[PDB]
Design a protein around this ligand. Structure first.
Ligand SMILES: CCCCCCCCCCCCCCCCCC(=O)OC[C@H](CO[C@@H]1O[C@H](CO[C@H]2O[C@H](CO)[C@H](O)[C@H](O)[C@H]2O)[C@H](O)[C@H](O)[C@H]1O)OC(=O)CCCCCCCCCCCCCCCCC
Ligand code: CLA
Ligand code: CLA
Ligand code: CLA
Ligand code: CLA
Ligand SMILES: CC(C)=CCC/C(C)=C/CC/C(C)=C/CC/C(C)=C/CC/C(C)=C/CC/C(C)=C/CC/C(C)=C/CC/C(C)=C/CC/C(C)=C/CC1=CC(=O)C(C)=C(C)C1=O
Ligand SMILES: CC1=C(/C=C/C(C)=C/C=C/C(C)=C/C=C/C=C(C)/C=C/C=C(C)/C=C/C2=C(C)CCCC2(C)C)C(C)(C)CCC1
Ligand SMILES: CC1=C(/C=C/C(C)=C/C=C/C(C)=C/C=C/C=C(C)/C=C/C=C(C)/C=C/C2=C(C)CCCC2(C)C)C(C)(C)CCC1
Ligand SMILES: CC1=C(/C=C/C(C)=C/C=C/C(C)=C/C=C/C=C(C)/C=C/C=C(C)/C=C/C2=C(C)CCCC2(C)C)C(C)(C)CCC1
Ligand SMILES: CC1=C(/C=C/C(C)=C/C=C/C(C)=C/C=C/C=C(C)/C=C/C=C(C)/C=C/C2=C(C)CCCC2(C)C)C(C)(C)CCC1
Ligand SMILES: CCCCCCCCCCCCO[C@@H]1O[C@H](CO)[C@@H](O[C@H]2O[C@H](CO)[C@@H](O)[C@H](O)[C@H]2O)[C@H](O)[C@H]1O
Ligand SMILES: CCCCCCCCCCCCO[C@@H]1O[C@H](CO)[C@@H](O[C@H]2O[C@H](CO)[C@@H](O)[C@H](O)[C@H]2O)[C@H](O)[C@H]1O
Ligand SMILES: CCCCCCCS[C@@H]1O[C@H](CO)[C@@H](O)[C@H](O)[C@H]1O
Ligand SMILES: [Cl-]
Ligand SMILES: [Cl-]
Ligand SMILES: [Fe+2]
Ligand SMILES: [Mg+2]
Ligand SMILES: [Mg+2]
Lengths: 62, 451, 37, 80, 342, 334, 29, 35, 37
């Protein structure tokens, strides 16, 4: 668990950095908006899941 | 550039946010994103504090302002304010930091992607600053929200573990509050107390039953008032008294926040109940009293009769009378005789400090507390060199009470300025002369001469 | 300290508190990019 | 205007940055080395952390004579 | 063929980004050396041999504590030229002896001369009356009285101000302890001219900004002005009524207003310079004799004046040993003035 | 009309020689009271036990002071922050001994000056002016609050308020330096840049406008007769002024826009003074100037003094001497 | 430490990168 | 002293009521332009 | 020549430079000479 946790958290951090750049750029980008809206929904659902994963896994490494 | 330059908006870049006054959608974005910055700081600052925290040093030797707030709510601490469990601090940090991403998301969405104005999309979320009933309704919603917040504090105190009580009999500890003060004579009494010495208005609140009781009252007052504003429109006397514009409502709120800031400054400087000295360090008054207690103890141990010891001026060196007769400590600390704290009260009787009790009953724990507080008085340099201004480098300390008082005086002051700026501006713009005097209708040219 | 499992993230935690200041500074980068119009 | 090229034209040009991406770092590094080699100490006569006092004196080497202050400093320095 | 002098004049007076002029030949080198000497000394040069202090970034000081410090008291008022009889051409020794102090002070003085000559030179070429040069006589009187006359009256350059932030603070506190300079009515007039000047600056800027004519549609009102416009941008009539009703009096003449704005802070600085000429000689407003006679005979008589003198006595005793190291003062703990406990 | 309406029209009339206004109804009585009490006290008050140690300090002219030494002396340290109106004293004699006039004066003055500031907003509204002169006045006002009210609150006593007199002011300044190292505090440093810079720009602006006055008078007349109150045309050539100053420094260092220039003249002193007010109001809670005492140490650990250490020695002298019979214990904690 | 400087460099570039990307792609700045 | 106190309490109350009622008496309307 | 490197980038990069060098000077207040340690 002490790696499946540390990856889940490193995954949450990396995705967060990608969303931090990607979401504003997408929202203010003229074209390519249909492929953006899909990815933003995907990014979002994945970020939420990873938070729940890191949160649950917290209790197996603390 | 829908309003995004000076030519079309009438506002330069440095007044850029004024371009948002009638863009309810983007302005909702601004607000929500901003709420996210606040929540972000709460979350990240807490985690930073926790990462830096050494649980066996006092919080106040470590430059913590947030952990102290969490501990005062009963989380993470036991008798004497000792840290028994850091995990509740970590939870508070993490949950704010995660929530900030959500607020940040909503803010960015509304600011740059969603509809610029909301009135076309929704009559419920759209608003005109001049619609008196819509403005009182939104106000009302926020009142109900604030009411619930106050009742959460009550819920923590009464049903979910209690609050850190510095006054707890036998020594400071977390305690469940079962008998909150509901009598309006006590609760509203605090509001009619003088703000001067020995009184201190609401800053004088000295027991958690009054604190919890006061929030039951505010919770219900705010929920009621909120319902009221949802169901009503301003009366005519209110209509004639106020200016009805976004910039005016901002000004009112700036004035209110300035006031609250000054109050908060005073709260943290003097109050040791809701800002427990175990977590925030001693108050200025406290530490000065604690010095007098320290040398009284020392000198009495060497054989001094502290009651009859006349100081150089003719006033008692250790003990003297207040201007109403009460026995108080001497030296410069005479000014601080309204101070009250759990290490000192056992020595106090109906006439003030009790000489029999001083001579016979001072416990080692009182000597320790007094020495600790004397040596962590809230004095220090901007680079965090603890002590008086002539002190040498050695001790890295500035009290959390000083950081919190100073910051909030600075913010309250500039918020007063903002209140005047925006209130004066709102008045002028409502009347039509905020951009200058009409050269062909200069009002002074139609007035008689003064002489 | 943070709980030991999170220790590798200490350095990141050290920097996060400054991010809000970077938002104010970002407002100026943005405005320079549109010529402070 | 007075005929010189606008600063804004100059500092947004590629030629300016080709020249100055060399000259700026070079000068910085030279200033760094002026200190890191200890040369700054000797040009200006500034004591290093180990040269304010001899090992057992606590008397400052204050100059007390106008016309042989040069020699007093010389002697203060030989006595370290 | 025109003459070489006239040809040089053309070239000196070309309209360029940085005007040069004949004044430029004095100004630029003296200003550049004063400023470069300060940056060099504060970055690299000690004060160990002159004062027994560290004073440069090299030694560990910060922007608040660095300085180019005055020379040792044993130097007297030596010009301390690089090639003079103290340093004898040795740059390193020169630095150690405080040669950069006199370097900065004398090049700074010649540079201020060059700056005010520049003010006259430009005023003449553009066709304006030289009031800006005249106003600049105040900063000159201050620099000359404080950096030059004051130490010339004293034992040595040592007691001039050293060029640094903390060093100047020290100079303030010395003046309180030794000269009781706050008590001096020439200082008091200086304070009134500086605070009165700052008052005029704030009140005049604010008044114009709040009596502007609406000359544009912008809520940001700066654009609604054109430099070549003939008309006043704000209402003098309305400003006058406002202040007449608020404060009881008001300006009504704009030429008088702007003249008064020159007069107040220039006159104040000039008054302060006269007081410092007195202090060069220790000719202080130190005491009120009548106060002293009473207080000496009557041990229950106390005023804020007698209180401040006790503070001065503390400053002198406690600071002199480290601040005046050439005096070799040793003040045993038992002689130091102290109140109770502290 | 009815009596109330007439009264309101008179209170708010734009035609009174001095504006009254609603801020004025509070300002007038409170400033008159502070003034009258101040004048009588300064002339004739007996000595006041400022430090609460039965050592009364003489402030008034009739009791041995002159204009430079005189003061209205702050209220006793035994009082602290307690409210001490006349009716709290057993007699006028007691009230005088304990420094009652100081509290009556400063409370009525701060209330009245606060209303002065509001009255500035108020008249500007009645005249159809822009509203922010009152914002400029908030700077000196804030400063007055700092030394008469906020510093006492922080330190726990009106006896630590600035005294109402010339030498008392210097006393307050010297003790403040001892206890806070104000000179090393960046907000005081901002204050000095504000007032030195306000003076500088005051002289600069006066001199530049004066330099460029349009010739409208003969050599045997003051040039001031060249401007007539209310004339529509500007009385100086700002383009000539800008031509001069732009060459003095360089072109883009000079203002050609009078609105921008005047805003700068307002802002620079107001802001610096807001900072210095906040220096006093934050040192009130003992967050003090920088302390570099013994910051520079040699290879062995010998202390190498800097100019900060020499300031420290001066501060020590002030510290050990001030209020020389009032301290019994070794630290001055307020 | 390399780790703190590296985090602060990456977090500090993110803001200007958002602006640079949008300016390149002629976005709604 | 009790009489001084009552007198000053009445005086202060009077001027405070003037201030409050005065500002409630159509203050936004007392300007030279839009009312 | 020209206007190739946009002014907003120059400003942002040069501003970040200033912050780094000043930040370094603040670091030095707490380590080595002048640190009081
Ligand atoms: C609409 C608004 C219109 C306003 C109209 C004016 C109405 C009058 C009131 C105005 C201000 C009163 C000044 C007195 C301030 C003061 O001494 O306030 C201090 C008090 C707290 O007082 C202290 O309260 C203490 C409470 O502690 C006690 O209880 C504690 C319980 O834990 C502890 O046990 C403690 O040891 C024990 O002493 C004691 O009673 C002290 O003796 C007592 O001094 O704060 C308080 O009442 C609350 C804080 C008041 C705010 C202070 C505002 C400062 C003004 C801003 C100025 C900026 C202006 C800029 C202009 C440009
Ligand atoms: C709390 C600070 C704050 C907030 C919340 C806002 C909010 C806003 N401003 Mg103000 N502004 C501020 C500070 C702020 N400003 C400061 C300090 C200045 C002075 C420099 C200004 C000067 C200013 C001007 C001159 C203007 C605004 C305008 C606006 C709005 C439109 C912005 C736009 O078009 O972006 C365009 C920019 C981009 C598309 C670049 C990206 C911007 C995004 C939001 C960056 C987000 C980064 C973040 C890390 C993303 C995390 C995502 C993750 C959670 C998934 C928006 C509501 C405009 C206006 O009102 O429009 C009607 C306008 O003209 N502002
Ligand atoms: C005060 C904050 C606030 C307000 C007034 C609004 C208002 C609006 N939003 Mg934004 N929004 C916000 C914050 C806000 N939003 C946040 C934080 C996010 C990120 C999740 C968003 C993301 C978002 C998107 C992506 C969209 C909107 C849209 C809308 C519109 C339709 C909403 C609706 O009909 O729901 C009706 C009610 C529900 C769907 C049920 C509400 C469920 C919530 C979770 C209950 C609240 C619980 C509790 C009180 C939480 C308080 C949190 C607090 C502690 C911070 C409306 C203009 C839409 C729009 O603009 O149309 C074009 C749209 O597409 N919102
Ligand atoms: C953020 C909270 C908030 C805000 C912005 C408003 C704003 C408003 N309210 Mg609502 N209200 C609220 C909360 C709020 N209210 C709550 C919680 C309740 C429940 C008790 C109410 C119950 C309520 C009623 C019953 C009424 C309003 C009315 C109004 C309007 C006029 C306000 C006014 O003139 O006050 C200014 C105050 C006065 C004119 C009173 C005189 C001034 C005194 C002397 C000031 C004293 C202050 C001083 C500093 C001392 C403080 C301490 C003191 C106890 C000694 C306005 C839209 C009125 C209305 O139009 O209803 C639709 C109205 O009748 N409100
Ligand atoms: C306008 C420019 C200017 C001015 C006014 C000054 C003025 C000064 N300098 Mg600075 N200086 C300058 C530019 C200037 N300098 C430049 C460009 C440099 C870099 C090279 C220096 C480097 C410098 C150093 C390193 C020092 C000074 C010093 C001085 C001081 C003494 C100078 C002296 O005695 O000269 C005497 C010379 C003259 C007055 C020239 C007279 C020429 C007359 C008119 C004709 C006579 C010629 C004669 C016949 C020749 C034959 C002689 C024969 C018998 C052998 C004085 C404050 C010293 C100082 O600051 O000490 C604290 C010092 O150590 N200067
Ligand atoms: C012997 C040898 C070698 C000889 C060679 C000589 C030679 C020919 C040299 C040529 C080469 C050369 C030039 C070398 C340079 C050397 C060098 C770098 C010297 C430097 C000296 C130096 C650094 C001096 C200090 C710099 C300096 C003056 C800075 C000023 C900065 C400053 C605060 C400016 C003020 C700007 C400002 C905000 C002004 C507004 C306030 C104000 C004036 C209000 C009033 C106002 C303004 C108006 O605007 C107008 C309109 C009106 C009405 C008005 O009220
Ligand atoms: C929580 C978290 C996170 C988050 C993040 C964020 C939220 C970020 C943000 C960021 C940002 C938000 C950034 C920004 C930046 C910025 C900058 C860096 C700026 C700068 C600026 C400058 C430098 C300026 C300059 C100038 C100009 C521009 C013009 C004028 C002049 C001057 C010079 C002033 C992450 C992902 C990590 C993950 C983990 C956790
Ligand atoms: C509009 C606008 C603006 C603004 C903006 C803003 C204000 C925004 C905000 C935003 C936000 C407000 C954001 C936030 C974010 C967040 C996040 C992204 C988070 C994350 C988190 C994480 C990732 C975590 C992790 C962890 C854990 C879980 C545990 C412990 C450790 C750690 C911490 C690591 C500006 C000014 C620019 C201008 C233009 C317009
Ligand atoms: C929680 C708590 C508590 C309680 C509290 C309470 C119960 C409170 C209340 C509070 C309140 C109950 C408040 C109130 C306030 C009010 C105000 C702040 C007002 C204001 C007003 C104004 C500002 C007005 C104005 C005007 C005038 C005067 C004239 C005409 C015009 C106008 C309208 C503008 C206690 C202390 C027990 C304890 C601790 C905790
Ligand atoms: C002495 C001498 C001489 C001369 C030399 C020279 C001339 C030099 C110069 C030098 C120089 C010329 C140097 C410079 C330096 C500089 C610096 C070191 C700077 C720094 C800066 C900074 C640090 C900045 C900061 C800031 C500010 C100011 C504001 C804004 C913000 C900030 C914070 C960024 C000769 C050889 C003749 C001879 C012998 C002696
Ligand atoms: C210590 C605080 C005690 C005060 C309590 C406050 C209670 C709040 C309710 C106040 C109700 C009074 O309502 C208000 O009364 C005044 C008094 O004439 C009215 O009267 C007036 O308005 C017009 C409108 O231009 C004026 O020019 C005129 O001189 C005046 O008669 C207001 O138009 C009315 O709206
Ligand atoms: C409209 C207001 C104008 C106010 C004018 C008031 C003058 C009328 C009242 C006269 C009262 C002054 O009375 C005063 O009393 C005490 C006696 O205890 C005297 O005693 C005093 O003597 C000296 C005089 O230099 C003082 O320095 C000293 O501090 C004090 O002991 C005063 O010298 C005397 O002048
Ligand atoms: C100052 C120096 C005095 C100028 S001197 C002058 O120089 C002229 C050229 O300009 C010559 O025509 C002339 O012969 C010579 O006398
Ligand atoms: Cl004491
Ligand atoms: Cl004193
Ligand atoms: Fe002007
Ligand atoms: Mg770490
Ligand atoms: Mg260092």
């Amino acid at each position: 668990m002490t790696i499946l946790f540390q990856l889940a958290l490193a995954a949450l951090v990396i995705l967060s950095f990608v969303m931090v750049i990607g979401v504003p750029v997408a929202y203010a980008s003229p074209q390519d908006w249909d492929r953006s809206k899909q990815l933003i929904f995907l990014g979002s659902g994945l970020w939420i899941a990873l938070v729940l994963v890191v949160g649950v896994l917290n209790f197996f490494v603390v | 550039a829908t309003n995004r330059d000076q030519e079309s908006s009438g506002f330069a870049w440095w007044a850029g946010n004024a371009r948002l006054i009638n863009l309810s959608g983007k302005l909702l974005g601004a607000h929500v994103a901003h709420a996210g910055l606040i929540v972000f700081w709460a979350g990240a600052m807490t985690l930073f504090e926790l990462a830096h925290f050494i649980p066996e040093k006092p919080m106040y030797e470590q430059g913590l302002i947030l952990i102290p707030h969490i501990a005062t709510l009963g989380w993470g601490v036991g008798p004497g304010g000792e840290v028994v469990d850091t995990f509740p601090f970590f939870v508070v940090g993490v949950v704010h930091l995660i929530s900030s991403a959500v607020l940040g998301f909503g803010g960015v969405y509304h600011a740059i992607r969603g509809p610029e104005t909301l009135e076309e999309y929704s009559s419920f979320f759209g608003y005109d600053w001049k619609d008196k009933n819509k403005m009182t309704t939104i106000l009302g919603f926020h009142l109900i929200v604030l009411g619930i917040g106050a009742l959460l504090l009550v819920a923590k105190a009464m049903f979910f573990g209690g609050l850190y009580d510095t006054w707890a009999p036998g020594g400071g500890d977390v305690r469940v509050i079962t008998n909150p003060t509901l009598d309006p004579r006590v609760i509203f009494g605090y509001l009619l107390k003088s703000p001067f010495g020995g009184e201190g208005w609401i800053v004088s609140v000295n027991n958690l039953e009054d604190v919890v009781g006061g929030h039951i009252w505010i919770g219900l007052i705010c929920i009621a008032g909120g319902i009221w504003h949802i169901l009503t429109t301003p009366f005519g006397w209110a209509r004639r008294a106020f200016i009805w514009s976004g910039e005016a409502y901002l000004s009112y709120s700036l004035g209110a926040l300035s006031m609250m800031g000054f109050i908060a400054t005073c709260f943290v400087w003097f109050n040791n109940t809701v800002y427990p000295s175990e977590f925030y360090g001693p108050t200025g008054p406290e530490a000065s009293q604690a010095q007098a207690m320290t040398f009284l103890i020392r000198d009495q141990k060497l054989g001094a009769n502290v009651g009859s010891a006349q100081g150089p001026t003719g006033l008692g060196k250790y003990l003297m009378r207040s201007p109403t007769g009460e026995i108080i400590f001497g030296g410069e600390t005479m000014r601080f005789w309204d101070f009250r704290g759990p290490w000192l009260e056992p020595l106090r009787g109906p006439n003030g400090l009790d000489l029999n009790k001083i001579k016979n009953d001072i416990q080692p724990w009182q000597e320790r507390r007094a020495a600790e507080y004397m040596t962590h008085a809230p004095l220090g340099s901007l680079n965090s060199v603890g002590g008086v201004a002539t002190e040498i480098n050695s001790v890295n300390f500035v009290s959390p009470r000083s950081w919190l008082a100073t910051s909030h005086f600075v913010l309250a002051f500039f918020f007063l300025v903002g209140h005047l700026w925006h209130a004066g501006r709102a008045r002028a713009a409502a009347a039509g002369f905020e951009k200058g005097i009409d050269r062909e209708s200069e009002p002074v040219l139609s007035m008689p001469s003064l002489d | 300290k943070l709980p030991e499992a999170y220790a590798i993230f200490d350095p990141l935690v050290d920097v996060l508190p400054v991010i809000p200041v970077l938002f104010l500074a970002l407002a100026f980068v943005w405005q320079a990019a549109v010529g402070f119009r | 205007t007075t005929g010189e090229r606008p600063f804004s034209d100059i500092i947004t040009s590629v030629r300016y940055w080709v020249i100055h991406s060399i000259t700026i770092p070079a000068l910085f590094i030279a200033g760094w080395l002026f200190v890191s080699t200890g040369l700054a100490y000797d040009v200006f006569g500034t004591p290093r952390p180990d040269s304010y006092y001899a090992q057992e004196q606590r008397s400052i080497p204050l100059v007390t004579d106008r016309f042989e202050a040069k020699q007093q400093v010389e002697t203060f320095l030989e006595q370290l | 063929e025109r003459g070489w002098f006239d040809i040089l004049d053309d070239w000196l007076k070309r309209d360029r980004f940085v005007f040069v002029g004949w004044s430029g030949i004095l100004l630029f080198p003296c200003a550049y050396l004063a400023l470069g000497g300060w940056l060099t000394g504060t970055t690299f040069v000690t004060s160990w041999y002159t004062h027994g202090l560290a004073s440069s970034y090299l030694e560990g000081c910060n922007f608040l504590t660095v300085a180019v410090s005055t020379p040792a008291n044993s130097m007297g008022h030596s010009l301390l030229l690089l090639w003079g009889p103290e340093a004898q051409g040795d740059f390193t020794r020169w630095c150690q002896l405080g040669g950069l102090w006199t370097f900065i002070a004398l090049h700074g003085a010649f540079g201020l001369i060059g700056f005010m000559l520049r003010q006259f030179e430009i005023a003449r070429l553009v066709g304006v009356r030289p009031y800006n040069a005249i106003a600049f006589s105040a900063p000159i009187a201050v620099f000359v009285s404080v950096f030059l006359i004051y130490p010339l009256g004293q034992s040595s350059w040592f007691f001039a101000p050293s060029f640094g932030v903390a060093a100047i603070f020290r100079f303030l506190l010395f003046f309180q302890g030794f000269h009781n300079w706050t008590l001096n009515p020439f200082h008091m007039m200086g304070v009134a001219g500086v605070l009165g000047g700052a008052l005029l600056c704030a009140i005049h800027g604010a008044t114009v900004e709040n009596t502007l004519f609406q000359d544009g549609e912008g809520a940001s009102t700066f654009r609604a002005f054109n430099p070549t416009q003939a008309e006043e941008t704000y209402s003098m009539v309305t400003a006058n009524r406002f202040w007449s009703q608020i404060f009881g009096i008001a300006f009504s003449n704009k030429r008088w207003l702007h003249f008064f704005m020159l007069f107040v802070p220039v006159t104040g600085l000039w008054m302060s310079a006269i007081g410092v000429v007195g202090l060069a000689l220790n000719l202080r407003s130190y005491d009120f004799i009548s106060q002293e006679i009473r207080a000496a005979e009557d041990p229950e008589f106390e005023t804020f004046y007698t209180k401040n003198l006790l503070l001065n006595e503390g400053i002198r005793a406690w600071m002199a040993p480290q601040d005046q190291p050439h005096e070799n003062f040793v003040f045993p703990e038992e002689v130091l003035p102290r109140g109770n406990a502290l | 009309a009815n009596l109330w309406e007439r009264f309101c029209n008179w209170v708010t009339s734009t035609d009174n020689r001095l504006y009254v206004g609603w801020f004025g109804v509070i300002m007038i009585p409170t400033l008159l009271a502070a003034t009258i009490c101040f004048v009588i006290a300064f002339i004739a008050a007996p000595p006041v036990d400022i430090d609460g140690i039965r050592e009364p300090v003489s402030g008034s002219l009739l009791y041995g002071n002159n204009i430079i030494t005189g003061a209205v002396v702050p209220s006793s340290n035994a009082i602290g922050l307690h409210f001490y109106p006349i009716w709290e004293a057993a007699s006028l004699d007691e009230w005088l001994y304990n420094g009652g006039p100081y509290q009556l004066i400063i409370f009525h003055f701060l209330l009245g000056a606060s209303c002065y500031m509001g009255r500035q907003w108020e008249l500007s509204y009645r005249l159809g002016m822009r509203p922010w002169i009152c914002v400029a006045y908030s700077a000196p006002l804030a400063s007055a609050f700092a030394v008469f009210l906020i510093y006492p609150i922080g330190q726990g006593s009106f006896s630590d308020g600035m005294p109402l007199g010339i030498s008392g002011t210097f006393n307050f300044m010297i003790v403040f330096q001892a206890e806070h190292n104000i000179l090393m505090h960046p907000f005081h440093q901002l204050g000095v840049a504000g007032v030195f810079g306000g003076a500088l720009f005051c002289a600069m602006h006066g001199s530049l406008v004066t330099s460029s006055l349009i010739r409208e008078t003969t050599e045997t007349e003051s040039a001031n007769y060249g401007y007539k109150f209310g004339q529509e045309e500007e009385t100086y050539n700002i383009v000539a002024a800008h031509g001069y100053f732009g060459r003095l420094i360089f072109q883009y260092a000079s203002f050609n826009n009078s609105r921008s220039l005047h805003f700068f003249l307002a802002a620079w002193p107001v802001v610096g003074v807001w900072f210095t007010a906040l220096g006093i109001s934050t040192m009130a809670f003992n967050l003090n100037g920088f302390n570099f005492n013994h910051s520079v140490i040699d290879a062995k650990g010998n202390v190498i003094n800097t100019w900060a250490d020499i300031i420290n020695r001066a501060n020590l002298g002030m510290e050990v001497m001030h209020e020389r019979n009032a301290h019994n214990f070794p630290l001055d904690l307020a | 430490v390399i780790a703190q400087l590296t985090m602060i460099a990456m977090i500090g570039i993110a803001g200007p990168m958002i602006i640079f990307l949008l300016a390149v792609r002629r976005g709604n700045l | 002293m009790e009489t001084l106190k009552i007198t000053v309490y009445i005086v202060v109350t009077f001027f405070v009521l003037l201030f409050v009622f005065g500002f409630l008496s159509g203050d936004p309307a007392r300007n030279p332009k839009r009312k | 020549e020209g206007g190739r490197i946009p002014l907003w980038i120059v400003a942002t990069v040069a501003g970040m430079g200033v912050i780094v060098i000043v930040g370094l000077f603040f670091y030095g207040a707490y380590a080595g000479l002048g640190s009081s340690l």
